[PDB]
mmCIF file with all atom_site columns, C-alpha atoms in Angstrom:
data_model
loop_
_atom_site.group_PDB
_atom_site.id
_atom_site.type_symbol
_atom_site.label_atom_id
_atom_site.label_alt_id
_atom_site.label_comp_id
_atom_site.label_asym_id
_atom_site.label_entity_id
_atom_site.label_seq_id
_atom_site.pdbx_PDB_ins_code
_atom_site.Cartn_x
_atom_site.Cartn_y
_atom_site.Cartn_z
_atom_site.occupancy
_atom_site.B_iso_or_equiv
_atom_site.pdbx_formal_charge
_atom_site.auth_seq_id
_atom_site.auth_comp_id
_atom_site.auth_asym_id
_atom_site.auth_atom_id
_atom_site.pdbx_PDB_model_num
ATOM 1   C CA . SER P 1 1   ? 68.366  101.464 149.469 1.00 60.08 ? 1   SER P CA 1
ATOM 2   C CA . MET P 1 2   ? 69.086  97.854  149.758 1.00 60.03 ? 2   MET P CA 1
ATOM 3   C CA . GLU P 1 3   ? 68.096  97.414  146.069 1.00 61.82 ? 3   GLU P CA 1
ATOM 4   C CA . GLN P 1 4   ? 70.844  99.989  144.983 1.00 61.99 ? 4   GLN P CA 1
ATOM 5   C CA . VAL P 1 5   ? 73.389  98.037  146.973 1.00 61.38 ? 5   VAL P CA 1
ATOM 6   C CA . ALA P 1 6   ? 72.338  94.739  145.368 1.00 62.40 ? 6   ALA P CA 1
ATOM 7   C CA . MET P 1 7   ? 72.602  96.419  141.908 1.00 63.13 ? 7   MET P CA 1
ATOM 8   C CA . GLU P 1 8   ? 75.974  97.783  142.862 1.00 61.61 ? 8   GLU P CA 1
ATOM 9   C CA . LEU P 1 9   ? 77.104  94.258  143.992 1.00 61.95 ? 9   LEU P CA 1
ATOM 10  C CA . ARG P 1 10  ? 75.964  92.868  140.536 1.00 62.36 ? 10  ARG P CA 1
ATOM 11  C CA . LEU P 1 11  ? 78.040  95.667  138.734 1.00 62.33 ? 11  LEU P CA 1
ATOM 12  C CA . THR P 1 12  ? 81.012  94.816  140.933 1.00 61.09 ? 12  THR P CA 1
ATOM 13  C CA . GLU P 1 13  ? 80.847  91.217  139.996 1.00 61.62 ? 13  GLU P CA 1
ATOM 14  C CA . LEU P 1 14  ? 80.436  91.999  136.294 1.00 63.60 ? 14  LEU P CA 1
ATOM 15  C CA . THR P 1 15  ? 83.473  94.172  136.572 1.00 63.93 ? 15  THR P CA 1
ATOM 16  C CA . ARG P 1 16  ? 85.309  91.190  138.179 1.00 66.03 ? 16  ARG P CA 1
ATOM 17  C CA . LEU P 1 17  ? 84.345  89.032  135.302 1.00 63.10 ? 17  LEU P CA 1
ATOM 18  C CA . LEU P 1 18  ? 85.147  91.666  132.568 1.00 60.51 ? 18  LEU P CA 1
ATOM 19  C CA . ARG P 1 19  ? 88.567  92.154  134.228 1.00 58.70 ? 19  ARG P CA 1
ATOM 20  C CA . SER P 1 20  ? 89.337  88.439  133.705 1.00 56.41 ? 20  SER P CA 1
ATOM 21  C CA . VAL P 1 21  ? 87.929  88.687  130.042 1.00 55.48 ? 21  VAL P CA 1
ATOM 22  C CA . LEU P 1 22  ? 90.068  91.659  129.464 1.00 55.57 ? 22  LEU P CA 1
ATOM 23  C CA . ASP P 1 23  ? 93.110  89.927  130.675 1.00 54.70 ? 23  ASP P CA 1
ATOM 24  C CA . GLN P 1 24  ? 92.492  86.927  128.485 1.00 55.08 ? 24  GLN P CA 1
ATOM 25  C CA . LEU P 1 25  ? 91.923  89.177  125.452 1.00 53.27 ? 25  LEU P CA 1
ATOM 26  C CA . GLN P 1 26  ? 95.058  91.154  126.036 1.00 49.25 ? 26  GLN P CA 1
ATOM 27  C CA . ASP P 1 27  ? 97.119  87.961  126.159 1.00 52.35 ? 27  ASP P CA 1
ATOM 28  C CA . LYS P 1 28  ? 96.076  87.437  122.612 1.00 53.18 ? 28  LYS P CA 1
ATOM 29  C CA . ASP P 1 29  ? 98.142  90.607  121.730 1.00 53.66 ? 29  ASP P CA 1
ATOM 30  C CA . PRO P 1 30  ? 101.553 89.553  122.771 1.00 50.07 ? 30  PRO P CA 1
ATOM 31  C CA . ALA P 1 31  ? 103.147 92.143  120.619 1.00 48.44 ? 31  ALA P CA 1
ATOM 32  C CA . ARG P 1 32  ? 101.350 94.870  122.670 1.00 48.89 ? 32  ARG P CA 1
ATOM 33  C CA . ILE P 1 33  ? 100.162 96.502  119.425 1.00 53.21 ? 33  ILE P CA 1
ATOM 34  C CA . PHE P 1 34  ? 96.732  97.430  121.064 1.00 54.93 ? 34  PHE P CA 1
ATOM 35  C CA . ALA P 1 35  ? 97.995  98.202  124.576 1.00 53.89 ? 35  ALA P CA 1
ATOM 36  C CA . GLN P 1 36  ? 97.985  101.971 124.347 1.00 52.85 ? 36  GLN P CA 1
ATOM 37  C CA . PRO P 1 37  ? 96.298  104.741 122.366 1.00 52.59 ? 37  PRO P CA 1
ATOM 38  C CA . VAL P 1 38  ? 97.681  105.472 118.967 1.00 49.01 ? 38  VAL P CA 1
ATOM 39  C CA . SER P 1 39  ? 100.027 108.430 119.579 1.00 53.62 ? 39  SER P CA 1
ATOM 40  C CA . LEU P 1 40  ? 98.658  111.677 117.976 1.00 52.97 ? 40  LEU P CA 1
ATOM 41  C CA . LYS P 1 41  ? 102.246 112.963 118.204 1.00 49.52 ? 41  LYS P CA 1
ATOM 42  C CA . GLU P 1 42  ? 103.432 110.066 116.041 1.00 48.80 ? 42  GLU P CA 1
ATOM 43  C CA . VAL P 1 43  ? 100.296 109.742 113.852 1.00 53.56 ? 43  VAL P CA 1
ATOM 44  C CA . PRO P 1 44  ? 99.076  113.421 113.696 1.00 53.21 ? 44  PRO P CA 1
ATOM 45  C CA . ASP P 1 45  ? 96.339  112.762 111.067 1.00 55.31 ? 45  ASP P CA 1
ATOM 46  C CA . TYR P 1 46  ? 94.848  109.833 113.028 1.00 53.85 ? 46  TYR P CA 1
ATOM 47  C CA . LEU P 1 47  ? 91.622  111.455 114.058 1.00 52.56 ? 47  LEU P CA 1
ATOM 48  C CA . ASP P 1 48  ? 90.975  112.464 110.434 1.00 55.06 ? 48  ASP P CA 1
ATOM 49  C CA . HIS P 1 49  ? 90.691  108.710 109.738 1.00 58.61 ? 49  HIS P CA 1
ATOM 50  C CA . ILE P 1 50  ? 89.341  107.185 113.087 1.00 61.13 ? 50  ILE P CA 1
ATOM 51  C CA . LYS P 1 51  ? 86.596  108.999 114.815 1.00 58.62 ? 51  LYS P CA 1
ATOM 52  C CA . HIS P 1 52  ? 86.420  106.810 117.994 1.00 62.59 ? 52  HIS P CA 1
ATOM 53  C CA . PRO P 1 53  ? 89.946  105.582 118.971 1.00 60.65 ? 53  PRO P CA 1
ATOM 54  C CA . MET P 1 54  ? 90.197  102.680 121.417 1.00 62.32 ? 54  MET P CA 1
ATOM 55  C CA . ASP P 1 55  ? 92.896  100.587 123.045 1.00 64.40 ? 55  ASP P CA 1
ATOM 56  C CA . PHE P 1 56  ? 93.270  98.234  125.970 1.00 60.22 ? 56  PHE P CA 1
ATOM 57  C CA . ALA P 1 57  ? 94.621  100.959 128.470 1.00 59.07 ? 57  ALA P CA 1
ATOM 58  C CA . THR P 1 58  ? 91.536  103.053 127.845 1.00 57.84 ? 58  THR P CA 1
ATOM 59  C CA . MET P 1 59  ? 89.202  100.006 128.267 1.00 55.70 ? 59  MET P CA 1
ATOM 60  C CA . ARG P 1 60  ? 90.982  99.295  131.500 1.00 52.96 ? 60  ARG P CA 1
ATOM 61  C CA . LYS P 1 61  ? 90.376  102.824 132.850 1.00 49.91 ? 61  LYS P CA 1
ATOM 62  C CA . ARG P 1 62  ? 86.637  102.530 132.100 1.00 49.89 ? 62  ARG P CA 1
ATOM 63  C CA . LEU P 1 63  ? 86.481  99.119  133.560 1.00 52.03 ? 63  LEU P CA 1
ATOM 64  C CA . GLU P 1 64  ? 88.039  100.093 136.881 1.00 56.34 ? 64  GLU P CA 1
ATOM 65  C CA . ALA P 1 65  ? 85.619  103.007 137.169 1.00 55.75 ? 65  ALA P CA 1
ATOM 66  C CA . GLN P 1 66  ? 82.859  100.343 136.716 1.00 56.92 ? 66  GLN P CA 1
ATOM 67  C CA . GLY P 1 67  ? 82.012  102.087 133.461 1.00 57.11 ? 67  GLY P CA 1
ATOM 68  C CA . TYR P 1 68  ? 80.734  98.954  131.608 1.00 58.86 ? 68  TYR P CA 1
ATOM 69  C CA . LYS P 1 69  ? 77.069  98.309  132.480 1.00 58.14 ? 69  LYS P CA 1
ATOM 70  C CA . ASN P 1 70  ? 76.770  95.030  130.430 1.00 55.99 ? 70  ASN P CA 1
ATOM 71  C CA . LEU P 1 71  ? 78.965  92.820  128.226 1.00 60.65 ? 71  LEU P CA 1
ATOM 72  C CA . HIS P 1 72  ? 77.538  94.516  125.085 1.00 62.15 ? 72  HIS P CA 1
ATOM 73  C CA . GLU P 1 73  ? 79.170  97.832  126.023 1.00 59.52 ? 73  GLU P CA 1
ATOM 74  C CA . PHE P 1 74  ? 82.579  96.088  126.639 1.00 60.81 ? 74  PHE P CA 1
ATOM 75  C CA . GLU P 1 75  ? 82.395  94.169  123.363 1.00 59.91 ? 75  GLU P CA 1
ATOM 76  C CA . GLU P 1 76  ? 81.714  97.400  121.496 1.00 58.53 ? 76  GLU P CA 1
ATOM 77  C CA . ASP P 1 77  ? 84.997  98.841  122.820 1.00 57.57 ? 77  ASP P CA 1
ATOM 78  C CA . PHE P 1 78  ? 86.857  95.684  121.839 1.00 55.07 ? 78  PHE P CA 1
ATOM 79  C CA . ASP P 1 79  ? 85.465  95.606  118.445 1.00 59.55 ? 79  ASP P CA 1
ATOM 80  C CA . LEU P 1 80  ? 86.524  99.333  118.016 1.00 59.02 ? 80  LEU P CA 1
ATOM 81  C CA . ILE P 1 81  ? 90.218  98.299  118.683 1.00 57.34 ? 81  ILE P CA 1
ATOM 82  C CA . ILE P 1 82  ? 90.012  95.662  115.927 1.00 59.13 ? 82  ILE P CA 1
ATOM 83  C CA . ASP P 1 83  ? 87.845  97.632  113.442 1.00 59.23 ? 83  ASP P CA 1
ATOM 84  C CA . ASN P 1 84  ? 89.817  100.900 113.707 1.00 59.83 ? 84  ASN P CA 1
ATOM 85  C CA . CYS P 1 85  ? 93.118  98.970  112.953 1.00 59.27 ? 85  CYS P CA 1
ATOM 86  C CA . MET P 1 86  ? 91.752  97.071  110.059 1.00 60.31 ? 86  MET P CA 1
ATOM 87  C CA . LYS P 1 87  ? 90.621  100.422 108.430 1.00 56.02 ? 87  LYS P CA 1
ATOM 88  C CA . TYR P 1 88  ? 93.765  102.544 109.128 1.00 53.34 ? 88  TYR P CA 1
ATOM 89  C CA . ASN P 1 89  ? 96.235  99.813  108.223 1.00 49.83 ? 89  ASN P CA 1
ATOM 90  C CA . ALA P 1 90  ? 96.517  97.906  104.994 1.00 50.29 ? 90  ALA P CA 1
ATOM 91  C CA . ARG P 1 91  ? 96.021  94.100  104.668 1.00 50.71 ? 91  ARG P CA 1
ATOM 92  C CA . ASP P 1 92  ? 99.740  93.505  104.224 1.00 50.66 ? 92  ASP P CA 1
ATOM 93  C CA . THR P 1 93  ? 100.835 95.109  107.569 1.00 49.37 ? 93  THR P CA 1
ATOM 94  C CA . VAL P 1 94  ? 101.786 93.578  110.880 1.00 48.01 ? 94  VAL P CA 1
ATOM 95  C CA . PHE P 1 95  ? 99.124  95.855  112.497 1.00 48.10 ? 95  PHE P CA 1
ATOM 96  C CA . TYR P 1 96  ? 96.285  94.535  110.366 1.00 47.75 ? 96  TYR P CA 1
ATOM 97  C CA . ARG P 1 97  ? 97.404  90.975  110.790 1.00 47.56 ? 97  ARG P CA 1
ATOM 98  C CA . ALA P 1 98  ? 97.601  91.442  114.508 1.00 47.47 ? 98  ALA P CA 1
ATOM 99  C CA . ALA P 1 99  ? 94.018  92.661  114.630 1.00 48.03 ? 99  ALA P CA 1
ATOM 100 C CA . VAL P 1 100 ? 92.767  89.648  112.568 1.00 45.23 ? 100 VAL P CA 1
ATOM 101 C CA . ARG P 1 101 ? 94.459  87.235  115.018 1.00 46.78 ? 101 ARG P CA 1
ATOM 102 C CA . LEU P 1 102 ? 93.116  89.158  118.018 1.00 44.85 ? 102 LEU P CA 1
ATOM 103 C CA . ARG P 1 103 ? 89.608  89.014  116.583 1.00 45.44 ? 103 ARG P CA 1
ATOM 104 C CA . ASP P 1 104 ? 89.815  85.362  115.848 1.00 45.96 ? 104 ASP P CA 1
ATOM 105 C CA . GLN P 1 105 ? 91.343  84.325  119.204 1.00 45.93 ? 105 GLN P CA 1
ATOM 106 C CA . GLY P 1 106 ? 89.119  86.742  121.205 1.00 49.31 ? 106 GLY P CA 1
ATOM 107 C CA . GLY P 1 107 ? 85.960  85.165  119.740 1.00 46.15 ? 107 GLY P CA 1
ATOM 108 C CA . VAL P 1 108 ? 86.363  82.006  121.829 1.00 44.64 ? 108 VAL P CA 1
ATOM 109 C CA . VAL P 1 109 ? 86.920  84.000  125.104 1.00 43.70 ? 109 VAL P CA 1
ATOM 110 C CA . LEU P 1 110 ? 83.849  86.249  124.330 1.00 44.78 ? 110 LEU P CA 1
ATOM 111 C CA . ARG P 1 111 ? 81.577  83.278  123.463 1.00 45.63 ? 111 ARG P CA 1
ATOM 112 C CA . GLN P 1 112 ? 82.016  81.779  126.912 1.00 44.12 ? 112 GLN P CA 1
ATOM 113 C CA . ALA P 1 113 ? 81.837  85.259  128.580 1.00 43.36 ? 113 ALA P CA 1
ATOM 114 C CA . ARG P 1 114 ? 78.367  85.733  127.207 1.00 45.73 ? 114 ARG P CA 1
ATOM 115 C CA . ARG P 1 115 ? 77.266  82.302  128.517 1.00 46.24 ? 115 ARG P CA 1
ATOM 116 C CA . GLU P 1 116 ? 78.693  83.250  132.087 1.00 48.58 ? 116 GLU P CA 1
ATOM 117 C CA . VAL P 1 117 ? 77.048  86.561  132.105 1.00 50.18 ? 117 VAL P CA 1
ATOM 118 C CA . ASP P 1 118 ? 73.603  85.094  131.185 1.00 47.59 ? 118 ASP P CA 1
ATOM 119 C CA . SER P 1 119 ? 74.191  82.047  133.366 1.00 48.72 ? 119 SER P CA 1
ATOM 120 C CA . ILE P 1 120 ? 75.259  83.936  136.639 1.00 48.95 ? 120 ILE P CA 1
ATOM 121 C CA . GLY P 1 121 ? 72.832  86.701  135.588 1.00 48.08 ? 121 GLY P CA 1
#
């Protein structure tokens, strides 16, 4: 149908916008602490601690498959990155501190993304 096409164009444009959001968020992680999944070879107990692991490479795979239907779903995954880290790592660690700075810097980006998503529809 023509409606299915129109819906698919909307999704494609959301994906375009979320790709730019993702790039902007990942720049706030210059140490690349959150770039890849926590290695289960190197942290064999991880899944005992963290039930839903997340990282920027995993988000990028979902994004490019157009797997985010709305900004809420994308933000859920970003919040998992931060929140998983802040639980697994102690306050005095470079990992925890990286997550706090990512959260704080990312908020600004996500605030305007939400306006753009609502604005453009």
